[PDB]
């Protein structure tokens, strides 16, 4: 088990850790989150009580270092930092626990939700999407735009998701215009899987990371990216059986976890209706289809 201590909590803020979240009052003596499960990525995120805009937060993996949060009154936000002095860090952590000023990561033992949402997400791939190589953790927020969004302005602050575009030369082989546009199998399997992602686990990890950014920060470009990666699979006639069964599990836990009140903006009607009912793989997402129908039949 691992800990992320907080120096203080000077401003009233809603703090999230993965799918959990807590309200913390201005200058309430809050000094961090303990019992954080080792073995997965994690995200700590913030929404100030005064600015219900700009949700922001940090992706991290405690195996990669000792991390803590500190409010910056110049930049006005809770910043993640790394403590390089291991002794100094166990010292802070042990005193804060002794004084019991830390919330415990509130996992139910029966629950594999977080595992299921992050199965293929690797911290090393995150840091290639969010390039800031002097930190081990990655900042994301509501307003950051993607590289593809930028093409249609500041590259330092961009989400470098893999660009997918169904009407591009990359996607369409000369002479196979109609075939490749109606059956994206060659774009999925040769260009994307064998070419760029190398394997399906990296593809699923980017898809999962895009979903989580859209859910936790309402990042619109991430929602676009999650839908595009779903649509590429569903619009392919030839997909490995192992990928379809795993995709059904991935999407199920994503739909299951989404806040009910957000289905309007987070769920693209056209893609879902095409994927579940018109696509090649209309019959391969049984659990995802069952949960969508019983929870958001309006969208369909």
């Amino acid at each position: 088990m691992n800990t992320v201590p907080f120096t203080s909590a000077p401003i009233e803020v809603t703090i999230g850790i993965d799918q959990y979240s807590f309200n913390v009052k201005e200058n309430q003596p809050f000094h961090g989150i303990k019992d954080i499960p080792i073995g997965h990525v994690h995200v700590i995120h913030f929404q100030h009580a005064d600015n219900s805009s700009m949700r922001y937060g940090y992706w991290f993996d405690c195996r990669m270092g000792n991390f803590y949060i500190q409010y910056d009154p110049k930049d006005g936000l809770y910043k993640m930092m790394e403590e390089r002095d291991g002794a100094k860090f166990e010292n802070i952590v042990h005193n804060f626990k002794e004084r019991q000023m830390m919330v415990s990561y509130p996992k139910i033992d029966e629950d594999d939700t977080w595992y299921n949402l992050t199965e293929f997400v690797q911290m090393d791939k995150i840091r290639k999407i969010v390039r800031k190589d002097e930190n081990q953790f990655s900042y994301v927020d509501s307003s950051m735009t993607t590289v593809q969004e930028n093409e249609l302005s500041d590259p330092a602050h961009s989400l470098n998701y893999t660009v997918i575009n169904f009407k591009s030369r990359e996607a369409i082989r000369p002479g196979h215009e109609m075939e490749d546009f109606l059956d994206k199998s060659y774009y999925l399997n040769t260009v994307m899987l064998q070419g760029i992602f190398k394997n399906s686990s990296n593809y699923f990890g980017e898809l999962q990371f895009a979903f989580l950014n859209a859910m936790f920060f309402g990042n619109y470009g991430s929602s676009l990216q999650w839908h595009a990666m779903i649509e590429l699979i569903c619009s392919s006639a030839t997909v490995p059986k192992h990928m379809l069964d795993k995709l059904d599990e991935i999407l199920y836990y994503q739909i299951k976890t989404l806040p009910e009140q957000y289905s309007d903006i987070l769920l693209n009607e056209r893609v879902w209706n095409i994927c579940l009912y018109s696509s090649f793989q209309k019959n391969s997402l049984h659990n995802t289809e069952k949960i969508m129908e019983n929870k958001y039949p309006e969208l369909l």
Partner: protein
């Protein structure tokens, strides 16, 4: 963006542009089989690709052999259209290539876009106009060359004959669309109007009769009358 009544004069500026109409690409007759089922038989069709400023028409004849052994032919027709339009652009010298291609049916946008990926600076546009280019096969010489074809064939025509020697493109396109609208609404009457007078012939290298200017006014009025009458009949007004 889409082409509509507002931006109509853009058709006659000096940016090269082409209309593409695919309605007559995949043409069938429907008949009964010996066992009483319904079958189709394809006949030859054509892509209608027209420069509205100059009248140059690129009539690409689609021979029934194209369809042999293919499924989902109405879908295939849109992609074959886009393939042939793309090949036409490729065949033209750079300075003759269009800057825009306007498709008369929105279902052609994705197939043409995909086939034109090599030409990113050629804009593919839909239109809100309800253009009558399906009636192109009511023009006797176009129907004749399509139906006689024994293989794929491109045939070039000026759809305005020599009108541009005396009228502007705007007026020429308005005459063409009036004539085609009429032929579409009531072919038999429209064709009667055009030919009633045997002393007015069609030049070998023309599509329409050699009317004088005054005679075009009477013709055009007769086509207007036809169109309005048929409308009252359709809707009982």
């Amino acid at each position: 963006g889409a082409m509509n009544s507002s931006n109509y004069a853009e058709l006659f500026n000096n940016d090269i542009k082409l209309f593409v109409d695919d309605t007559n690409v995949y043409r069938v007759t429907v008949h009964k089989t010996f066992e009483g089922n319904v079958a189709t038989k394809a006949i030859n069709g054509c892509i209608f690709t027209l420069n509205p400023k100059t009248g140059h028409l690129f009539l690409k004849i689609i021979h029934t052999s194209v369809w042999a052994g293919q499924k989902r032919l109405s879908q295939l027709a849109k992609w074959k259209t886009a393939e042939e339009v793309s090949a036409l652009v490729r065949s033209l010298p750079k300075e003759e290539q269009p800057k825009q291609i306007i498709v008369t049916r929105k279902a052609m946008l994705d197939p043409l876009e995909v086939h034109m990926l090599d030409f990113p600076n050629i804009a593919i546009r839909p239109t809100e106009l309800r253009l009558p280019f399906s009636a192109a096969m009511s023009i006797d010489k176009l129907s004749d060359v399509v139906m006689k074809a024994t293989e794929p064939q491109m045939v070039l025509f000026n759809i305005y004959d020599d009108w541009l020697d005396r009228i502007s493109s705007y007026t020429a396109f308005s005459r063409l669309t009036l004539l085609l609208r009429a032929l579409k609404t009531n072919e038999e009457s429209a064709k009667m109007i055009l030919l009633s007078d045997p002393t007015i012939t069609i030049k070998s290298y023309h599509l329409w009769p050699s009317f004088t200017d005054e005679q075009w006014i009477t013709i055009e009025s007769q086509m207007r009358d036809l169109i309005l009458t048929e409308y009252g009949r359709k809707y009982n007004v």
